[PDB]
Amino acid sequence: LHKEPATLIKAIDGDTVKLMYKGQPMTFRLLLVDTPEFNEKYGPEASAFDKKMVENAKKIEVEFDKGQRTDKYGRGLAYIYADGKMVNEALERQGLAKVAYVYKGNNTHEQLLRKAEAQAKKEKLNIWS
Numbered sequence: 001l002h003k004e005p006a007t008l009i010k011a012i013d014g015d016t017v018k019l020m021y022k023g024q025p026m027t028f029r030l031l032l033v034d035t036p037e038f039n040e041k042y043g044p045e046a047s048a049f050d051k052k053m054v055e056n057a058k059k060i061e062v063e064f065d066k067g068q069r070t071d072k073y074g075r076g077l078a079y080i081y082a083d084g085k086m087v088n089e090a091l092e093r094q095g096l097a098k099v100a101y102v103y104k105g106n107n108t109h110e111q112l113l114r115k116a117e118a119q120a121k122k123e124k125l126n127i128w129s
């Protein structure tokens with residue numbers, strides 16, 4: 001997999017973010033994770049966490065997996081990095097998302113994320129508290 005540049009347009013919620021990619025505005029949906037909706041428990045904390053990560057970053061990158069790059073809603077599907085740190089993994093490690101939506105062919109970082117979730121679970125963080 002390869003990292004490609006993008007710039008933040010705006011935070012949306014725990015697992016979606018508006019980025020300019022190849023000069024076009026797009027909503028990105030983070031691969032392999034599920035954050036609570038804003039209206040659900042830990043939703044606001046997940047939204048805030050993703051926001052801080054992407055707003056504080058000097059450099060946002062997107063990394064598509066090997067499979068589909070857009071979902072049925074036109075959202076880009078990617079791993080998103082903030083100064084080289086993966087947002088998807090960071091949410092997992094903090095107990096602010098669950099590994100989910102693991103579809104064959106777009107699951108390169110599955111075990112990395114499951115490992116983070118396990119440590120969050122062990123630590124009883126947030127969703128696992």
Ligand SMILES: Cc1cn([C@H]2C[C@H](OP(=O)(O)O)[C@@H](COP(=O)(O)O)O2)c(=O)[nH]c1=O
Pocket residue numbers: 029030031032033034071072077101103
């Ligand atoms: C993460 C992800 C979600 N989706 C779709 C499946 C779900 O369809 P349904 O809307 O029919 O449930 C939806 C979940 O996204 P959200 O969690 O953002 O709602 O997005 C993909 O198709 N591929 C993906 O990789």
Ligand SMILES: [Ca+2]
Pocket residue numbers: 015034035036037
């Ligand atoms: Ca969600």
